[PDB]
Amino acid sequence: GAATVLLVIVLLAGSYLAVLAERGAPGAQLITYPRALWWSVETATTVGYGDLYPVTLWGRCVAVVVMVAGITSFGLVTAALATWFVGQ
């Protein structure tokens, strides 16, 4: 219920930092905030579209942080699994 707050904090912090890390790296596509936010979601949700990813060392770090913070933070699925387990 409140975890979902940390998720948006990360997804936004990740989105931002990611762009910072990647610009400068010739060939990097993670360089505009908007799509960087789309990347961050894909990452936490862990979904697998492989359409956007990092190439710099730092970028991969922001990546790792988003995976940890976000894959965990997505410990929000369960709350939605509880409410949907009760009122149904």
Partner: antibody, heavy 118, light 108 residues
Framework: QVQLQQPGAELVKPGASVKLSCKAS????????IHWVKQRPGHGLEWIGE????????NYNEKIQKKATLTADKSSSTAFMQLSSLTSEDSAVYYC???????????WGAGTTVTVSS | DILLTQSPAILSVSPGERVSFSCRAS??????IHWYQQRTNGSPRLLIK???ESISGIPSRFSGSGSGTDFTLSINSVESEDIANYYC?????????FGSGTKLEIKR
């Protein structure tokens, strides 16, 4: 009102350096990047580099000899481009432009004409 | 780095005629292409963003299309004020790059 203000011209003797300025107004976001573009007379637009004022990091075009060093002053909302050891090859109009972190140059400065001559 | 090819370098059209500027990317860049207009002694001005999105303040006359490697900037019924140099610019991959530009010439 003019979003990006740049001085009209700068005369520089060969070998010397000059610091160009770009004063920005209007909305400012932590996601703004200030770009610099060079254009020689009769020629096209060449990207020089970019800087993110909120963090202070700068990136440069790798394909060209590095003549510039970018900095930014948050309190005065001014971005600077230090060009050093110039030659006539460096004579051109230098534009500054603002990008909201979404890929396009929403607005451009009027440009500073730099002439390298004795 | 992505190379943007703008050919022909000069396009001659008669008044009121529709014109199309070409921009080809060396590799696929989705719709991450933007167009700028630069009149003699003027600074560049954004005309179209993300291949086909309108910019407020720009005449409806201007439109863009394409995706992938081939893009087009079109002007329906050209008029004198459209005389200028037109540049494309990509933001799909770092670093951003510019096309070499196409000049619009009107045969009156």
């Amino acid at each position: 009102q003019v979003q990006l203000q740049q001085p009209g011209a700068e005369l520089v003797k060969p070998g010397a350096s000059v610091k160009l300025s770009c004063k920005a107004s209007g909305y400012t976001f932590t996601s703004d990047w200030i770009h610099w573009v060079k254009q020689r007379p009769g020629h096209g637009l060449e990207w020089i580099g970019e800087i993110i004022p909120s963090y202070g990091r700068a990136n440069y075009n790798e394909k060209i000899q590095k003549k510039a060093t970018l900095t930014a002053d948050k309190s005065s909302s001014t971005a600077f481009m230090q060009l050093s050891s110039l030659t006539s090859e460096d004579s051109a109009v230098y534009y500054c432009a603002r990008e909201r972190g979404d890929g396009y140059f929403a607005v451009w400065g009027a440009g500073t004409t730099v002439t390298v001559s004795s | 780095d992505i190379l943007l090819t703008q050919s022909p370098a000069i396009l001659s059209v008669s008044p009121g005629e529709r014109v199309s500027f070409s921009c080809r990317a060396s590799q696929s860049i989705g719709t991450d292409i933007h167009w700028y207009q630069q009149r003699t002694n003027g600074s560049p001005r954004l005309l179209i963003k993300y291949a086909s999105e309108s910019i407020s303040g720009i005449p409806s006359r201007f439109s863009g299309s394409g995706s992938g490697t081939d893009f087009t900037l079109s002007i329906n019924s050209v008029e004198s004020e459209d005389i200028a140099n037109y540049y494309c610019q990509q933001s799909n991959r770092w670093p951003f790059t510019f096309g070499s530009g196409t000049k619009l010439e009107i045969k009156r």
